[PDB]
Amino acid sequence: KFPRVKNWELGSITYDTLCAQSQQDGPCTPRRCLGSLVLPRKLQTRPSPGPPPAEQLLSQARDFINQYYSSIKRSGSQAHEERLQEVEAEVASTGTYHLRESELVFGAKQAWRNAPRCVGRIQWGKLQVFDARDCSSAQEMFTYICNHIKYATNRGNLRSAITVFPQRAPGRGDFRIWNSQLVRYAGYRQQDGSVRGDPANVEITELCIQHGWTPGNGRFDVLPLLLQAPDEAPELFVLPPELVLEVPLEHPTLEWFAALGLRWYALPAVSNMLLEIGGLEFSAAPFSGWYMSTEIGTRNLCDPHRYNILEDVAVCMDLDTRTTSSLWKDKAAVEINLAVLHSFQLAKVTIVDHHAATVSFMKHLDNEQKARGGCPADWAWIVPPISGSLTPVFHQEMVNYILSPAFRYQPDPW
Amino acid sequence: GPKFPRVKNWELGSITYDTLCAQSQQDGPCTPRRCLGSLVLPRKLQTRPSPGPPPAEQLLSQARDFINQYYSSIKRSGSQAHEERLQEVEAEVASTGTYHLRESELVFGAKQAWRNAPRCVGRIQWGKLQVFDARDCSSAQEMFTYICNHIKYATNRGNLRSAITVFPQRAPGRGDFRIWNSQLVRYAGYRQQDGSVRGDPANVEITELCIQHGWTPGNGRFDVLPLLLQAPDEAPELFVLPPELVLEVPLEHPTLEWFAALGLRWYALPAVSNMLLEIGGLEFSAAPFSGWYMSTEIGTRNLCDPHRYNILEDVAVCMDLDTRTTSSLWKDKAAVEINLAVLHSFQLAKVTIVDHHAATVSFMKHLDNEQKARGGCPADWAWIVPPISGSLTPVFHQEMVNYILSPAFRYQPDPW
Numbered sequence: 001k002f003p004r005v006k007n008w009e010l011g012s013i014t015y016d017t018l019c020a021q022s023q024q025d026g027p028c029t030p031r032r033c034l035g036s037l038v039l040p041r042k043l044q045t046r047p048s049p050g051p052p053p054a055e056q057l058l059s060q061a062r063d064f065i066n067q068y069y070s071s072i073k074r075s076g077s078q079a080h081e082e083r084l085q086e087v088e089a090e091v092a093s094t095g096t097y098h099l100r101e102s103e104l105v106f107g108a109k110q111a112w113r114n115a116p117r118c119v120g121r122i123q124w125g126k127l128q129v130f131d132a133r134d135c136s137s138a139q140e141m142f143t144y145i146c147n148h149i150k151y152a153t154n155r156g157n158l159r160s161a162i163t164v165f166p167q168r169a170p171g172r173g174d175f176r177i178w179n180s181q182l183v184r185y186a187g188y189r190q191q192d193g194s195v196r197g198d199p200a201n202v203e204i205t206e207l208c209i210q211h212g213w214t215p216g217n218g219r220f221d222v223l224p225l226l227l228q229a230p231d232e233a234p235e236l237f238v239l240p241p242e243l244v245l246e247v248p249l250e251h252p253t254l255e256w257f258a259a260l261g262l263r264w265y266a267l268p269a270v271s272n273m274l275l276e277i278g279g280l281e282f283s284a285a286p287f288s289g290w291y292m293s294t295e296i297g298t299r300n301l302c303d304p305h306r307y308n309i310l311e312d313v314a315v316c317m318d319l320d321t322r323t324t325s326s327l328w329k330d331k332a333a334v335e336i337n338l339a340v341l342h343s344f345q346l347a348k349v350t351i352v353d354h355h356a357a358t359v360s361f362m363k364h365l366d367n368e369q370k371a372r373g374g375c376p377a378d379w380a381w382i383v384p385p386i387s388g389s390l391t392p393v394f395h396q397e398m399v400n401y402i403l404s405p406a407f408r409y410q411p412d413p414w
Numbered sequence: 415g416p417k418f419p420r421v422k423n424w425e426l427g428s429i430t431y432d433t434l435c436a437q438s439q440q441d442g443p444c445t446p447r448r449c450l451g452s453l454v455l456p457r458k459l460q461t462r463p464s465p466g467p468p469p470a471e472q473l474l475s476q477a478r479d480f481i482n483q484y485y486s487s488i489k490r491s492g493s494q495a496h497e498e499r500l501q502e503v504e505a506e507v508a509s510t511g512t513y514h515l516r517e518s519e520l521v522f523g524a525k526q527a528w529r530n531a532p533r534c535v536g537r538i539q540w541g542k543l544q545v546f547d548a549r550d551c552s553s554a555q556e557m558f559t560y561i562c563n564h565i566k567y568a569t570n571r572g573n574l575r576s577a578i579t580v581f582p583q584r585a586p587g588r589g590d591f592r593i594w595n596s597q598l599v600r601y602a603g604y605r606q607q608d609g610s611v612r613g614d615p616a617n618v619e620i621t622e623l624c625i626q627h628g629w630t631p632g633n634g635r636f637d638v639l640p641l642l643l644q645a646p647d648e649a650p651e652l653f654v655l656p657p658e659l660v661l662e663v664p665l666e667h668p669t670l671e672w673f674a675a676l677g678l679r680w681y682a683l684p685a686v687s688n689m690l691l692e693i694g695g696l697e698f699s700a701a702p703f704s705g706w707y708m709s710t711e712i713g714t715r716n717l718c719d720p721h722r723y724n725i726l727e728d729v730a731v732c733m734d735l736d737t738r739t740t741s742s743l744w745k746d747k748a749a750v751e752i753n754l755a756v757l758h759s760f761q762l763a764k765v766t767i768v769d770h771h772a773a774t775v776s777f778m779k780h781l782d783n784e785q786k787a788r789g790g791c792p793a794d795w796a797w798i799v800p801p802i803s804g805s806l807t808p809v810f811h812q813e814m815v816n817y818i819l820s821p822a823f824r825y826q827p828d829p830w
């Protein structure tokens with residue numbers, strides 16, 4: 001039935017009745033918990049060469065349309081009943097249907113709201129939705145992306161946004177953004193298999209040079225985009241420098257930090273996920289908000305398989321890197337995170353630290369408890385990578401489950 | 415590929431398949447519909463008081479399974495001794511409704527239970543456990559003697575040795591042997607008039623329970639609590655631990671001279687005493703165990719949790735940090751220094767302790783050993799990854815499969 005959910009810091013308890021609406025299965029079973037896994041083994045997004053069972057697509061649609069009219073307090077109204085028949089009509093005749101701009105906006109916001117792994121969902125209602133379904137080329141995707149970047153960036157005063165390109169069509173190819181994010185630093189594999197730049201982007205980097213991109217030779221070279229229209233070879237487009245806002249990293253008191261020459265971009269814009277709304281799939285729907293300092297300061301810069309700058313900083317800090325018990329790792333991680341915050345604030349670019357971010361997520365949980373009777377959340381992804389139990393979320397139990405609309409992982413186009 | 419959970423390590427890109435979970439003979443709280451893995455106490459393992467003797471039928475299969483595990487472990491599966499031991503257990507259950515374990519079987523089961531603990535990151539030490547057999551114990555008084563003996567062997571003047579003391583199993587129509595305290599060593603939690611708590615808020619209940627049972631309470635911030643030991647069908651008796659036996663460590667920072675003036679301290683012996691030890695169906699309601707601390711348990715959870723000592727702000731103020739803004743990362747800075755203090759103080763006092771980095775690295779070694787020896791290892795990510803510097807340790811990047819294997823350590827309802 002309904003799971004009891006406790007907060008070990010306050011002693012409070014709540015039941016989750018929202019998970020009841022979950023119409024999609026996760027990777028867990030009573031025999032064993034696989035919630036710690038990042039990617040689904042079967043919850044993928046298999047091909048769309050043959051239409052989707054009208055039985056299925058139709059129930060999802062009726063449900064989403066139902067969701068939409070409850071949202072505007074016009075359920076059972078006339079428009080509602082007639083909107084349902086339109087969908088019924090279109091599906092029966094073509095095997096698919098289309099969303100109205102307004103339904104799309106509602107759908108995009110709900111997908112974010114439902115994202116179990118997002119700690120910044122308190123902002124879910126503030127999302128600028130760019131309808132890019134009137135797109136027929138890779139060059140057009142690029143203009144749309146450039147407009148999204150400009151708006152989202154807004155000279156450092158970041159504004160959340162999503163751009164939705166054409167939905168998937170049976171038997172036809174997908175519109176796709178090959179890059180995992182609109183802005184990423186190249187990863188160049190060198191001599192002894194080592195890597196210059198972002199090791200996380202080695203592959204996308206190689207695919208780019210393999211399509212005519214002239215590579216640079218730095219640690220932070222902004223990658224070009226590989227946009228792809230249905231059944232066509234992806235096309236390469238370089239982003240106008242003045243559009244890619246970046247932040248040079250320096251430390252408040254450690255004068256030498258700026259020397260490292262480290263930097264990060266201001267816009268976190270995930271572009272390889274799929275947006276599903278009422279059964280319709282949007283293979284290319286890039287979204288962006290703003291960074292929470294740990295994503296850069298802890299993960300991107302200190303992960304062993306990423307920039308892994310932990311030792312360089314510890315050495316410049318003159319710390320005892322001989323033993324683990326000197327906590328040189330913990331000490332250096334704290335200064336790098338401080339530098340990200342300080343640097344972003346100094347440059348007047350939006351950013352939120354992990355304490356403020358998780359405090360605001362706690363309010364969101366409360367808001368959702370009242371609004372829907374629960375909130376799907378993935379603990380491992382919600383608790384910050386450093387100072388975990390120093391934040392409120394750590395001490396809060398959570399229920400993870402899939403609701404629709406939703407953002408989902410999808411296979412790599414190559 | 416393999417029809418078992420695929421487990422990946424994102425740091426090293428390596429993959430493995432857990433086949434050991436197929437051996438799980440009990441479900442957890444999750445379902446295809448929703449994951450409840452973050453719940454601390456999900457009504458599943460919960461070994462609730464089942465007074466009436468267990469289905470001889472259910473106890474038999476659990477018993478049969480354990481015995482097979484045991485003969486497997488000594489490489490004698492299918493042997494004559496195995497079959498005879500099998501017939502024996504079945505006879506004893508048939509006539510008495512329960513059964514008993516041989517000495518060597520108890521030692522094996524104890525170690526397996528630790529080996530099987532999903533929430534323990536120090537399981538690389540699982541094969542080195544001192545099992546004190548106290549199944550002959552017949553009084554709260556004798557319980558106190560064994561416990562003192564355990565603490566003395568386990569403490570070993572700072573050179574800590576892992577151990578477990580096993581008291582009599584639960585019996586049909588009889589009271590359970592029970593240790594009311596959550597740990598052989600806990601600090602008192604005094605409720606204040608203004609509403610606050612002096613000492614450790616985690617033990618307020620157990621503190622009021624000793625008082626209600628005759629303990630003359632103190633008024634310190636670190637008062638070692640007495641033990642409430644309960645023999646079958648009898649009110650728990652009260653016992654006070656000889657101060658010389660309870661080893662404690664004063665906390666000082668290596669470079670911050672004022673930290674020591676804070677008067678902070680902690681005991682060296684971490685000894686869980688309220689968990690149930692389950693082996694082949696038999697239930698050991700009282701079987702306290704101990705090992706040694708991983709610095710973050712003390713430095714981060716005990717001293718910095720909001721509902722515990724919560725000393726973060728006090729230390730941050732002494733460090734002259736900006737505690738009015740979150741972006742100054744004042745909480746982080748203070749946590750680090752406090753964890754450093756704990757580590758430094760134990761090393762100075764020559765008392766066994768391991769930092770979160772060393773510990774997680776050794777747990778990664780343990781995961782590899784288990785992958786080969788059993789085809790996997792049940793682990794609870796949220797509990798394995800340290801409360802500070804999570805992604806800085808190797809386990810953070812290691813996906814993990816969680817499931818229940820038996821023998822096992824389980825939670826049990828409070829005796830009162």
Ligand code: HEM
Nearest residue numbers: 112115117118119120123160162287288289290291292407
């Ligand atoms: C307003 C600022 C926002 C902040 C501070 C924020 C922060 C985060 C963080 C920290 C994560 C985890 C990242 C990681 O560990 O890889 C995350 C994940 C996610 N967020 Fe947000 N988010 C924000 C806006 C958005 C927006 C506007 C959307 C969508 C419209 C969104 C959708 C998601 C999704 C789907 C994930 C999971 C991605 C994955 O599985 O890799 N977020 N967010």
Ligand code: HEM
Nearest residue numbers: 528531533534535536539576577703704705706707708823
């Ligand atoms: C030798 C060093 C040991 C270390 C460093 C170690 C460390 C840990 C840590 C850090 C935890 C989690 C604590 C928490 O977050 O509350 C834990 C949990 C646990 N350990 Fe170990 N452990 C050790 C010895 C033992 C021994 C000897 C046993 C039993 C024979 C054991 C059984 C368990 C169990 C059952 C749990 C979970 C208890 C619960 O649910 O609260 N550990 N251990």
Ligand SMILES: CC(=N)NCCC[C@H](N)C(=O)O
Nearest residue numbers: 268289290291292295296300
């Ligand atoms: C919107 C947002 N804040 N985060 C989405 C994920 C971005 C990724 N963790 C990164 O560090 O680039």
Ligand SMILES: CC(=N)NCCC[C@H](N)C(=O)O
Nearest residue numbers: 684704705706707708711712
């Ligand atoms: C054996 C061990 N290291 N830990 C068991 C649990 C102890 C508890 N976390 C505490 O901080 O007292």
Ligand SMILES: [Zn+2]
Nearest residue numbers: 028033444449
């Ligand atoms: Zn689960």
